[PDB]
C-alpha cells in the first residue's frame, strides 16, 4: 500500500538513525509506535516523513531519559534542525490535548469534588471580577482559587484555603490576597439565582 510503503521506509530510517547513535531497541520500538500514532494526522500533512521520524526519535529519547540529543539527532538525519524542530512542536500539540483557558474551574472543581452549581457560581464570580477590573495584575489561577473559595464557602460544600491551595498549586497567601479584592463586591459577583447556605454578608473575612 502507498500508506504502508511510507511506513516501511520510515521504520527503515528510524532503525538506520538509531544504530547511527547506538540507541537500544526499546527506544526504536517506542519511536515506531509514536510515529504510527502521529504521521497521518492534520498538522503533519505535507510534512516530510523523514522529519516526522527524526522528531519522533528525539521524543522517544526525551521520554525514556536518554539526554542532550536535539543537535545529535539532526546530525544523523538528512533533515534540517528547523524542519525537525517544527515537526517536534506539532507532535507535542498532537500528544497534549490538556492545558489552560475557567478551564481551571472545570479541573479544580472535579479535583475538589464540587457540584455543577458551585463550579458555575465560582466561574461567574471569577469572570465578573475581571469584567469589573476588581483583580488587576492578579494570577488567573489565584483569582480562580479565591472564586472557588468564595463560592464553596457560600454553599453547603465548603472547602478550605489549604486544600484549594493544594489543588490550584498556589500559596494560601495568594488565595487570601485575591479573595480580599473580590470580598467587597461579593453580593454583585454571585449569580442572582444562587441559593446561599451561608448568607453573602456572613461570608468569611480573610
Swiss-Prot record:
Region Core promoter DNA-binding: start-end pairs: 82-86, 139-142, 173-176
Record note on what altering residue 78 to E does: Reduces interaction with SSU72. Inhibits interaction with VP16. Inhibits RNA pol II transcription activation induced by VP16 but does not affect basal transcription
Residues modified as N6-acetyllysine: 128
Region (Necessary for TATA box-bound TBP complex formation): 134-206
Residues the entry annotates as binding DNA: 45, 47, 82, 89, 138, 162, 171, 174, 176, 180
Phenotypic consequence of residue 176 to A: Reduces DNA-binding
An MF annotation (GO) of this entry: acetyltransferase activity
Intervals holding Sequence repeats: 17-93, 108-184
Enzyme class: transferase
Tissues and organs where the protein is expressed, per its UniProt entry: Expressed in the inner cell mass forming the embryoblast. Not detected in cells from the outer thin layer trophoblast (at protein level).
Protein family per UniProt: Belongs to the TFIIB family.
UniProt free text on domains: The TFIIB-type zinc-binding domain is necessary for the interaction and recruitment of RNA polymerase II to the core promoter, the formation of a fully competent pre-initiation complex (PIC) assembly and basal transcription initiation. The C-terminus is necessary and sufficient for interaction with the TATA box-bound TBP complex and for the formation of PIC.
Protein name (Swiss-Prot/TrEMBL): Transcription initiation factor IIB
